Short mmCIF file of C-alpha atoms and ligand atoms in Angstrom, two decimals:
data_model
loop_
_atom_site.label_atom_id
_atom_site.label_comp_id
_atom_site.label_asym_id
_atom_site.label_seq_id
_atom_site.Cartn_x
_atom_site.Cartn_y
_atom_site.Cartn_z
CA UNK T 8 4.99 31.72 -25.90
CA UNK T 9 3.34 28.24 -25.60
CA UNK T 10 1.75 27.51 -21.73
CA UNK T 11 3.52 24.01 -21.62
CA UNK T 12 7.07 23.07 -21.38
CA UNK T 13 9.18 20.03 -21.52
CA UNK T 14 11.14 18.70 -18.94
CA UNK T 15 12.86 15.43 -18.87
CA UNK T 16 12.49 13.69 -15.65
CA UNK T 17 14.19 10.44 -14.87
CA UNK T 18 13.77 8.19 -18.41
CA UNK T 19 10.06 10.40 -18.68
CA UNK T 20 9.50 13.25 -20.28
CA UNK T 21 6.77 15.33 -18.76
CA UNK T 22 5.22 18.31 -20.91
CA UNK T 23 3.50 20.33 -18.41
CA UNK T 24 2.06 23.92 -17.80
CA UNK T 25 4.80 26.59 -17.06
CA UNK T 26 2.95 26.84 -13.19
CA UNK T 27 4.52 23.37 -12.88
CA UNK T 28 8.22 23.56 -12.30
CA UNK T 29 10.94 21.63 -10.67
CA UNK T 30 10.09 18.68 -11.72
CA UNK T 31 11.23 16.05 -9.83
CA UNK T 32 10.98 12.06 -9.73
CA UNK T 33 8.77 11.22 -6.96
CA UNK T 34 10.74 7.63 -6.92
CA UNK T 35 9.66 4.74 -5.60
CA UNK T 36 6.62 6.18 -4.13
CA UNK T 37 5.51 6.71 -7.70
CA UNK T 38 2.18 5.37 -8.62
CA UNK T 39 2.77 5.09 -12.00
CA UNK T 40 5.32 7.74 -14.14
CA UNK T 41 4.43 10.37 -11.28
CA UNK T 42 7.02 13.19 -10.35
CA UNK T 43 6.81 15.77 -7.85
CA UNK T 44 6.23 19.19 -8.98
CA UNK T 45 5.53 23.09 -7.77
CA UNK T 46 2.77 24.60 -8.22
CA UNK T 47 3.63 27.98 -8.43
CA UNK T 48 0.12 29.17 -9.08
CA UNK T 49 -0.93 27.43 -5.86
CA UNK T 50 2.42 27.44 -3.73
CA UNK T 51 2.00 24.13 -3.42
CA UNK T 52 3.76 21.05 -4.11
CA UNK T 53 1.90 18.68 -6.64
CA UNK T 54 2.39 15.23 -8.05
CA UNK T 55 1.75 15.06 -11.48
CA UNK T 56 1.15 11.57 -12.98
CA UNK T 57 1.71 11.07 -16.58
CA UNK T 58 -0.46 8.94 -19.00
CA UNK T 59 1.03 8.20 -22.22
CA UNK T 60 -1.40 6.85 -24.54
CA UNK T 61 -4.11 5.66 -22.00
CA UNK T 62 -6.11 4.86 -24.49
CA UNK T 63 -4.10 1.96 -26.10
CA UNK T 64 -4.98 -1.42 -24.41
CA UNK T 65 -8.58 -1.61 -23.21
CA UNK T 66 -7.96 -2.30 -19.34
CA UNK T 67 -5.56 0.39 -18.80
CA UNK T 68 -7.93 3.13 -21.32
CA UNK T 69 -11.25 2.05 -18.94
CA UNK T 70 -9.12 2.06 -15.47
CA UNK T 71 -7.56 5.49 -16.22
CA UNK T 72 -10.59 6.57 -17.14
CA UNK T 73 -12.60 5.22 -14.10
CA UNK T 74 -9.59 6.81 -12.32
CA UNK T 75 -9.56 10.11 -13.71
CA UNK T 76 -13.41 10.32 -13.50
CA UNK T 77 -13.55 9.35 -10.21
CA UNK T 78 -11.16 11.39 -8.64
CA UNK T 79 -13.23 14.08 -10.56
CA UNK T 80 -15.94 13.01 -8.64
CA UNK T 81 -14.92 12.21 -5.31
CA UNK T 82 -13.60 14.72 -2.92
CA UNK T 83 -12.58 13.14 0.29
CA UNK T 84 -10.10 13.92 2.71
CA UNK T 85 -8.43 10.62 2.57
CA UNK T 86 -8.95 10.12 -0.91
CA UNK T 87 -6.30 11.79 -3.16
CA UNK T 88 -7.84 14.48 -4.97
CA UNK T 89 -7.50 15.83 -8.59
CA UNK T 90 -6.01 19.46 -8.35
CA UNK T 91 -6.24 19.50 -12.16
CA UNK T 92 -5.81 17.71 -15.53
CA UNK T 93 -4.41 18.13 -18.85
CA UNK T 94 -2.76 17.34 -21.88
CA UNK T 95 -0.12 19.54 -23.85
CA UNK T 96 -2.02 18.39 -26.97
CA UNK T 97 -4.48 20.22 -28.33
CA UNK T 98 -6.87 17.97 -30.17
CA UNK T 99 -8.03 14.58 -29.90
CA UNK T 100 -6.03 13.79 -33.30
CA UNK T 101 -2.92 14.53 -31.77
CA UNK T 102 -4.15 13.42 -27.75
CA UNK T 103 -1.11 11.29 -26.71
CA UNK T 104 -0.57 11.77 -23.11
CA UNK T 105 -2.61 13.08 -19.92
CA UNK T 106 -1.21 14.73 -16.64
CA UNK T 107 -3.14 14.28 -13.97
CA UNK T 108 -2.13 16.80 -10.78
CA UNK T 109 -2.84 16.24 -7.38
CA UNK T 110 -1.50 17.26 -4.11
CA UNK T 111 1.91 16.20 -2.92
CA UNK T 112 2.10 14.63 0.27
CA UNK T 113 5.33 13.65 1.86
CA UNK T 114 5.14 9.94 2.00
CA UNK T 115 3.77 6.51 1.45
CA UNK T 116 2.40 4.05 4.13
CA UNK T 117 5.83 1.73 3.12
CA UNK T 118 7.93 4.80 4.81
CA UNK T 119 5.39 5.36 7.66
CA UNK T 120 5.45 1.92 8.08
CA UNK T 121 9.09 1.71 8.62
CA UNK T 122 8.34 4.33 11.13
CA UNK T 123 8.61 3.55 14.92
CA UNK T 124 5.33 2.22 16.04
CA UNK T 125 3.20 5.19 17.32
CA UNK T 126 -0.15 4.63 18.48
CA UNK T 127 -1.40 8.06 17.66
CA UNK T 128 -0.22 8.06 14.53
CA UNK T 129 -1.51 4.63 13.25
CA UNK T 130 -4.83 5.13 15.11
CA UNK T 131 -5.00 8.15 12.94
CA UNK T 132 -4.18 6.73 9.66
CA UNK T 133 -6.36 4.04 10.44
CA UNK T 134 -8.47 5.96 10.95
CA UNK T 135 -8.27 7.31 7.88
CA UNK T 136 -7.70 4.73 5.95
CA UNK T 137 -11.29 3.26 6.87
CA UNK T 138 -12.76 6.74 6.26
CA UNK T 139 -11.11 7.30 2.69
CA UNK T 140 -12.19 3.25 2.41
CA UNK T 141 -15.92 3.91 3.81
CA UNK T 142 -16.44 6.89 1.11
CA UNK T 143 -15.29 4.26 -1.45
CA UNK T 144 -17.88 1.95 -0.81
CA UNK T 145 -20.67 4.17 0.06
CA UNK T 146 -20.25 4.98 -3.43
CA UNK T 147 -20.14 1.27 -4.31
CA UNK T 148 -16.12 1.51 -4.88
CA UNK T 149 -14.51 -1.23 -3.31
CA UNK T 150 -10.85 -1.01 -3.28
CA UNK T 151 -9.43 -4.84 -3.28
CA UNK T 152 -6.30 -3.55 -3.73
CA UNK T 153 -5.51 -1.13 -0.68
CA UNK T 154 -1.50 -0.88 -0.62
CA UNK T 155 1.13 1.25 1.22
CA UNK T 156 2.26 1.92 -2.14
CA UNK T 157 -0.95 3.21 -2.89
CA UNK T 158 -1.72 5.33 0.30
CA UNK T 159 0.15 8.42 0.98
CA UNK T 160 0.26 10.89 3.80
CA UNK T 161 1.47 14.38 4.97
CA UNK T 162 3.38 15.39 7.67
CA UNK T 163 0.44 16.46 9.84
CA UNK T 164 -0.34 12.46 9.10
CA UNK T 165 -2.89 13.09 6.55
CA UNK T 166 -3.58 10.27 4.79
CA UNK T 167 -4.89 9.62 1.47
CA UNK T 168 -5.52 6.91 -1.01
CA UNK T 169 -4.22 6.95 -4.37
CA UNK T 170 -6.28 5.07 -6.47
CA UNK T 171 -9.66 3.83 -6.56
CA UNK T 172 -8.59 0.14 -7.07
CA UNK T 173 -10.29 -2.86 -8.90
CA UNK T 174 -13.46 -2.60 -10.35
CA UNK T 175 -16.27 -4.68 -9.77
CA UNK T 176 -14.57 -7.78 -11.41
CA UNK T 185 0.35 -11.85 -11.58
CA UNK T 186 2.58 -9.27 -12.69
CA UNK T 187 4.15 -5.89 -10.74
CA UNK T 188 0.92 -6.85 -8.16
CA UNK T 189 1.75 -6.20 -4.70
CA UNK T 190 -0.75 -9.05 -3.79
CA UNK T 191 0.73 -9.31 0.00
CA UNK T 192 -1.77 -6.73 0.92
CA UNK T 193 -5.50 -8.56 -0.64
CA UNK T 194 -8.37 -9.59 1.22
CA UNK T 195 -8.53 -13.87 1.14
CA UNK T 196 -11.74 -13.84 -0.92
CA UNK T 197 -9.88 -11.65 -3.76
CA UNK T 198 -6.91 -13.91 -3.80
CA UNK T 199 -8.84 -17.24 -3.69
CA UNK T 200 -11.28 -15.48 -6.46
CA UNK T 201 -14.42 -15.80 -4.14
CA UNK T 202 -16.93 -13.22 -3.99
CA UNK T 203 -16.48 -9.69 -2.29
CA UNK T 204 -18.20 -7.10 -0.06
CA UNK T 205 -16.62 -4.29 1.32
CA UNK T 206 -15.55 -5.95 4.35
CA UNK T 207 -12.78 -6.86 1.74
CA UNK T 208 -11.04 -3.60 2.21
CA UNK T 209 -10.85 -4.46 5.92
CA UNK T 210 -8.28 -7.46 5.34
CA UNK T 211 -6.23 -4.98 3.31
CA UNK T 212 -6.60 -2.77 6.50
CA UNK T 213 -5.68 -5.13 8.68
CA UNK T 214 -2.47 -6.45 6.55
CA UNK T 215 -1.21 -2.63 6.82
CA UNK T 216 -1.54 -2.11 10.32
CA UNK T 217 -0.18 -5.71 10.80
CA UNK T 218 2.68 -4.96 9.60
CA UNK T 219 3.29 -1.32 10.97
CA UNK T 220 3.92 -3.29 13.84
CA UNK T 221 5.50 -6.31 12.78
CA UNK T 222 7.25 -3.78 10.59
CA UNK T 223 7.32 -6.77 8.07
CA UNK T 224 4.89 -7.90 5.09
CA UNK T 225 2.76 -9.91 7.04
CA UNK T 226 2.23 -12.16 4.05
CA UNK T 227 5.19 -12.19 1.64
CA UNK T 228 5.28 -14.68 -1.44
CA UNK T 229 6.53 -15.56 -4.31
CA UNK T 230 3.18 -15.63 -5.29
CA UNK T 231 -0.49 -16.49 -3.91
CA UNK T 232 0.86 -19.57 -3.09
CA UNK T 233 3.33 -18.80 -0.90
CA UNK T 234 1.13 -15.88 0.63
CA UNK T 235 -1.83 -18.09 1.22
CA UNK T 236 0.55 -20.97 3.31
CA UNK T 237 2.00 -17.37 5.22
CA UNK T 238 -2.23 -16.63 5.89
CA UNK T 239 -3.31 -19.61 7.07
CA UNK T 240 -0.17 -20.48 8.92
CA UNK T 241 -0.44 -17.38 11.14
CA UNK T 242 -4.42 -17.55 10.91
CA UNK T 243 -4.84 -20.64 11.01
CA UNK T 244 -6.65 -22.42 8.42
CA UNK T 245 -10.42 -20.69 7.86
CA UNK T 246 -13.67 -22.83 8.59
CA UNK T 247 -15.37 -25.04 6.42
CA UNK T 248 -18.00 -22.43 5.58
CA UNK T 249 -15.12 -20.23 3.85
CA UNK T 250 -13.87 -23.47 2.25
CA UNK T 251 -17.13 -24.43 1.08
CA UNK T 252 -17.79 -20.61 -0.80
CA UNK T 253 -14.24 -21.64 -2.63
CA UNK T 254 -14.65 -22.75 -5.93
CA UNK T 255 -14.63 -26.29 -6.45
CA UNK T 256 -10.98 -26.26 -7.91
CA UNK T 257 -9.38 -24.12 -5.60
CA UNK T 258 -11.01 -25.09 -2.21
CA UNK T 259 -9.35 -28.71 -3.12
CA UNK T 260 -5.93 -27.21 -3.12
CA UNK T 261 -7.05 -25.28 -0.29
CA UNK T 262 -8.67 -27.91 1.78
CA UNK T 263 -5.85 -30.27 1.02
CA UNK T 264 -3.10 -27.74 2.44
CA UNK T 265 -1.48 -28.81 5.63
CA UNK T 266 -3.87 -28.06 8.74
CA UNK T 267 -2.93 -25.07 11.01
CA UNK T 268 -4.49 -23.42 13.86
CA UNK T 269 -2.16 -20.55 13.19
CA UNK T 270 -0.43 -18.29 15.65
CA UNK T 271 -2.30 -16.03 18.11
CA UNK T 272 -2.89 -12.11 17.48
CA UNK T 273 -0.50 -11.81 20.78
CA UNK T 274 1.95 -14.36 19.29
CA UNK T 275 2.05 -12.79 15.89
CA UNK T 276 2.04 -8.98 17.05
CA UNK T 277 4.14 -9.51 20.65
CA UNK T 278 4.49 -6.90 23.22
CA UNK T 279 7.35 -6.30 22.16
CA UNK T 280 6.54 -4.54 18.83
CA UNK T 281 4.20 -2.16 20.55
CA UNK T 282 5.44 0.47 22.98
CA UNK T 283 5.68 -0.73 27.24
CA UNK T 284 6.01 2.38 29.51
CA UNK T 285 2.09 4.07 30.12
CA UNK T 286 -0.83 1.84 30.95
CA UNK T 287 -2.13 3.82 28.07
CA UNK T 288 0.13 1.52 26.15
CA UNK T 289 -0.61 -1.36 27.65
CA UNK T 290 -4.31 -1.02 26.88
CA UNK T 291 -3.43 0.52 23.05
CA UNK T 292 -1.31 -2.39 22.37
CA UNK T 293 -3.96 -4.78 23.21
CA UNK T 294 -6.51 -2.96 21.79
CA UNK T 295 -4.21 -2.40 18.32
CA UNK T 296 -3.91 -6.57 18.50
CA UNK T 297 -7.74 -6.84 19.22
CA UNK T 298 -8.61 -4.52 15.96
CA UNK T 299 -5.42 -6.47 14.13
CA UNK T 300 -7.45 -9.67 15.08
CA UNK T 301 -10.92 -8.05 13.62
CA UNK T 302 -8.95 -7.63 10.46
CA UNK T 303 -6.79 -9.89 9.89
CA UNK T 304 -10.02 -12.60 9.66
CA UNK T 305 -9.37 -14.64 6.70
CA UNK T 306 -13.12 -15.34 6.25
CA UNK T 307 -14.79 -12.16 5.33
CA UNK T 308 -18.16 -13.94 6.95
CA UNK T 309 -16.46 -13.07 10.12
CA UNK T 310 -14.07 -10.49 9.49
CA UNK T 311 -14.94 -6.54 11.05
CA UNK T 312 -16.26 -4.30 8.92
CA UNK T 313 -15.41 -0.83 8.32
CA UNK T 314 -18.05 0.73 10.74
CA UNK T 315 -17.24 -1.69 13.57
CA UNK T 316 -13.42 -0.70 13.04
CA UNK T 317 -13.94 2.54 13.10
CA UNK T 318 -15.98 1.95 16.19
CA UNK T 319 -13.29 -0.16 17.94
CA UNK T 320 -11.58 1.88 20.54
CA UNK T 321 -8.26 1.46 18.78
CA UNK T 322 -9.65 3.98 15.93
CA UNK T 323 -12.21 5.12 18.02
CA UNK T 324 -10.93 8.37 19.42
CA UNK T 325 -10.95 9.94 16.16
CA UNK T 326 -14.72 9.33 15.15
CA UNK T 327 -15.83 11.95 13.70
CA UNK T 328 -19.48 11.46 12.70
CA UNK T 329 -19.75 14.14 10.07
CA UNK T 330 -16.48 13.17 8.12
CA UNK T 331 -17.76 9.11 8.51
CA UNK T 332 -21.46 9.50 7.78
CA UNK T 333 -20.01 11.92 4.73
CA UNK T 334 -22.47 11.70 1.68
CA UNK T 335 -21.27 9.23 -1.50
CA UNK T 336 -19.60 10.53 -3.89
CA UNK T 337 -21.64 12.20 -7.00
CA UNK T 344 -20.08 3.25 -15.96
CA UNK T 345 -19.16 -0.45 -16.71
CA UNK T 346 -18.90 -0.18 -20.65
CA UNK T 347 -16.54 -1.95 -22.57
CA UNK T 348 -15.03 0.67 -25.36
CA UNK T 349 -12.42 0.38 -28.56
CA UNK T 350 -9.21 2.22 -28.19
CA UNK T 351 -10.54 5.25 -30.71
CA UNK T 352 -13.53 5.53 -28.56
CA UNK T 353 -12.00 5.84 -25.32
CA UNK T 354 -9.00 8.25 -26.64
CA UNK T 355 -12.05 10.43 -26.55
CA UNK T 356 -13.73 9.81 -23.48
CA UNK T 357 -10.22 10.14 -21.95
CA UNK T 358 -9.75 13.56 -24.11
CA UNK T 359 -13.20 14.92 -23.57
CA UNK T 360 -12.83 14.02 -19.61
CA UNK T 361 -9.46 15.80 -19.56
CA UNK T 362 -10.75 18.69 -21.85
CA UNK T 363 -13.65 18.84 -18.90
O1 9HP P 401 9.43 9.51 -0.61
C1 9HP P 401 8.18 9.76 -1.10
C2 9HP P 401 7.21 8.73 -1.26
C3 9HP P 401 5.93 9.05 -1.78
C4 9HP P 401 5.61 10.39 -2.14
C5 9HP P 401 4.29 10.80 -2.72
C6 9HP P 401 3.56 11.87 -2.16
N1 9HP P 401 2.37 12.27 -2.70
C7 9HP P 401 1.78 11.67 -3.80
C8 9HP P 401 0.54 12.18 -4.27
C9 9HP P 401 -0.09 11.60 -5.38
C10 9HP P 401 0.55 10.50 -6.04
C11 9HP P 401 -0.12 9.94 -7.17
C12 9HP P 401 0.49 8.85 -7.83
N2 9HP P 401 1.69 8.33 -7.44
C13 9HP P 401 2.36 8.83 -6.36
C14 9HP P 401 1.85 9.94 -5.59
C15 9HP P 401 2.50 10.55 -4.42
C16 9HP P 401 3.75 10.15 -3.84
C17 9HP P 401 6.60 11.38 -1.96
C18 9HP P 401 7.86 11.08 -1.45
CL1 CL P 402 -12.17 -18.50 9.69
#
């Protein structure tokens, strides 16, 4: 009569409560070994991410941990939340895997983005975006590593983010979407999040990474070739190393916003348009600012008329949410098992 139940999805197998059925691989929107699942205690449609033996390296134990205790924590429309957690296990001895459940939502930014252009609609995720991405860093979280992978959304285009990214400190890294100072290992502020911000709604219109490469190499030449290359002031904050491969890379003064986002990826008709699509290159240029020294912040984007219309002052000026240890696999098996076990 056990509560759990096994069900093989895709090469996983996923052990979860009987309320969970119809298991279902998620796919390529899947954050990890994530399925879609219903709820049927709360008619509702849940992804349930798997964890198998968080516990075992030391990164991964402290980041799902972070993770799990954060989303805990933080309760945020734009932030994905944590409609519950568990493991079929019944004692840390035995603790192997964790499930964490959270609401469904129909699709990533990488569909959306694929989407025809809509001004609404990206205003409003935008929007979003920088809310989710303001509650982050009013609580001192600082994402880095803002993806479309990583941001999902509903029909109603309710947008959350996944994860909680870095923590204050390159394999199956979708690097095309971080800030210049991450990249080029330079200092941060949240203003980082912004170039993230900007890379997305870049390329919702360009409909194309706006900074593809093999590597940071590659992605860097793509930056600065459409940017232009940054001012000696950002050069100078680069480390002595890299700001010599840096410095030494061929000069550009990079495109234009209106060269690298045309009218011709943004809608024509209305004057409403018109003024949207200049105002979406205008915020794209307040991003897209390789130096963070000059780049817009989160408050001024949300100000900027693009994202404007959906200020809302009560869901911006929302209160932070409610450590930094180094552990030993045994030790954090617990902490992960007591944090699941509530
Ligand atoms: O085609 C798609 C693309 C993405 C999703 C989708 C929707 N909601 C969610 C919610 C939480 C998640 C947590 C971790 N990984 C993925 C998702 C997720 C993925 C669903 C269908
Ligand atoms: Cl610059």
């Amino acid at each position: 009569d056990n509560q759990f139940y096994s069900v093989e999805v895709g090469d996983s197998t996923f052990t979860v409560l009987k309320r969970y059925q119809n298991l279902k691989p998620i796919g390529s929107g899947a954050q990890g070994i994530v399925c879609a699942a219903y709820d049927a205690v709360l008619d509702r449609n849940v992804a349930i991410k798997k964890l198998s033996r968080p516990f075992q390296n030391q990164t991964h134990a402290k980041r799902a941990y972070r993770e799990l205790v954060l989303m805990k924590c933080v309760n945020h429309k734009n932030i994905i939340s944590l409609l519950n957690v568990f493991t079929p296990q019944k004692t840390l001895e035995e603790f192997q895997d964790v499930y964490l459940v959270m609401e469904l939502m129909d699709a990533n930014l990488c569909q959306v983005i694929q989407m025809e252009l809509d001004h609404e609609r990206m205003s409003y995720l935008l929007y979003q975006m920088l809310c989710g991405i303001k509650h982050l860093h009013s609580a001192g979280i600082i994402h880095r590593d803002l993806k479309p992978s990583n941001i999902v959304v509903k029909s109603d285009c309710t947008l959350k983010i996944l994860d909680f990214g870095l923590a204050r400190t390159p394999y199956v890294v979708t690097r095309y979407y971080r800030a210049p100072e991450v990249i080029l290992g330079m200092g941060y502020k949240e203003n980082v999040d912004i170039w993230s911000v900007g890379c997305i709604m870049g390329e919702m219109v360009r409909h194309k990474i706006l900074f593809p490469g093999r590597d940071y190499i590659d992605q860097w030449n793509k930056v600065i070739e459409q940017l232009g290359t940054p001012c000696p002031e950002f050069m100078k904050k680069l480390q002595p190393t890299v700001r010599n491969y840096v410095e030494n890379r061929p000069k550009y003064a990079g495109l234009t916003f209106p060269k690298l986002f045309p009218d011709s990826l943004f809608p024509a008709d209305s004057e409403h348009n018109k003024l949207k699509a200049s105002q979406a290159r205008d915020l794209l240029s307040k991003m897209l600012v390789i130096d963070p020294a000059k780049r817009i912040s989160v408050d001024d984007a949300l100000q900027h008329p693009y994202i404007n219309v959906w200020y809302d002052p009560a869901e911006v000026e929302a209160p932070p949410p409610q450590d930094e240890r180094e552990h030993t696999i045994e030790e954090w098996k617990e902490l992960i098992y007591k944090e699941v076990m509530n």
